Amino acid sequence: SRCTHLENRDFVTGTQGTTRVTLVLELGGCVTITAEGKPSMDVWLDSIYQENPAKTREYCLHAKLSDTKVAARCPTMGPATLAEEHQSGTVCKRDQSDRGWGNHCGLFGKGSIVTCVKASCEAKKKATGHVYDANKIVYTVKVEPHTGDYVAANETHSGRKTASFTVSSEKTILTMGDYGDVSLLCRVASGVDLAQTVILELDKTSEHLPTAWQVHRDWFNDLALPWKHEGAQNWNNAERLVEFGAPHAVKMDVYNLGDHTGVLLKSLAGVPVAHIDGTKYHLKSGHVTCEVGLEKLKMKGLTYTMCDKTKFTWKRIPTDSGHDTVVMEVAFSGTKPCRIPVRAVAHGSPDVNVAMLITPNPIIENNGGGFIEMQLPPGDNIIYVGELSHQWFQKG
Amino acid sequence: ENPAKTREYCLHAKLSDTKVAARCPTMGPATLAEEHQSGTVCKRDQSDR
Ligand SMILES: *[C@@H]1O[C@H](CO)[C@@H](O)[C@H](O)[C@H]1NC(C)=O
Structure with a gap:
């Protein structure tokens, strides 16, 4: 009995005249179903997953800053300028610098200064988001007959049966060997809110972190970092990882605001993990609703x-x-x-x-x-x- | 000349391809694919078994 392996369990009881039991199955729960003159059953939601869910917005956690270029002008000559200002993958600031004689300049006043820093992302310092598709997500429901066999949690019951519920999956019949048949219809929309949900993923090879986190869609779009879509060549809002130090004559000070990984991980403390079994991205919390058909089960x-x-x-x-x-x-x-x-x-x-x-x-x-x-x-x-x-x- | 048809009615039905399915007292409702199909008449009832 799988539901002995868990400290979350529920017991469902039908009379002799019962058919089509309606359940909510939750990840890390398990249900034992009982009915008079029927074998009892352990039923659980094993997993909710998708193969290769669509990459959404990538974020950059740490900028790699280069090609700081400065141009400046004397107070009459209007704007200073750089070709950088029009290139891809640059951050720039325009400001006013005090000028005068000996600042190698004709007049005492404020001169236009512009600085531009080339700004790629640091290697493997990406936080990628993924989004689930209701037309490709798989719920997995598992059933075992509640026989007199004990099998440990590292071992498999030979009477264990599995049903996948895609959106393309209708009422499915599992033959419980000598115990007859059970039927399942789990409605994949009567489950998790897949529009509200992002799988946040960092470096998969990080030995001392979760593979991913299950995060809210609005919060993910509110991460305050440089970002780009899949296959886009250069970061939007690269400004967010660069500070400019107050202008000094013909200087303005380009400062790399450092690796924000720990800023993210503090905001991901206690957040639900998500496993990544290669191409399969698994939720670790959430639920589905099912009807279970007991009416073709047999007592052995x-x-x-x-x-x-x-x-x-x-x-x-x-x-x-x-x-x-x-x-x-x-x-x-x-x-x-x-x-x-x-x-x-x-x-x-x-x-x-x-x-x-x-x-x-x-x-x-x-x-x-x-x-x-x-x-x-x-x-x-x-x-x-x-x-x-x-x-x-x-x-x- | 040829005034517009309204409804046709049938005065004498023709019945063919009768099918029956039954289920024992607790195995839930008996069903046929013909309960969906067009041009079938069906009845659902209880039988003492
Ligand atoms: C389960 O774990 C126990 C204890 O280590 C071991 O004796 C047993 O062989 C394991 N079973 C399987 C199928 O891995």
């Missing part, structure tokens, strides 16, 4: 022999899961497929079985089946698996 092995009540041992003793459920695993020593004789008793009242199983009709197979999950009332209880027993105290 309801016609199997009850197991020999003597032949059980624990593999894993009754344990609190943190979800108010108790989990355990048993071995069985007959060479058989059989129904596990599981029950639990409120201590001192042996007649009323109080085991609400989460694994319905628990069964041991020729390989697999020993794991059981159940819910119990507060106070002292005894769990039984035939002749095995374990006194269990239930909190709250």
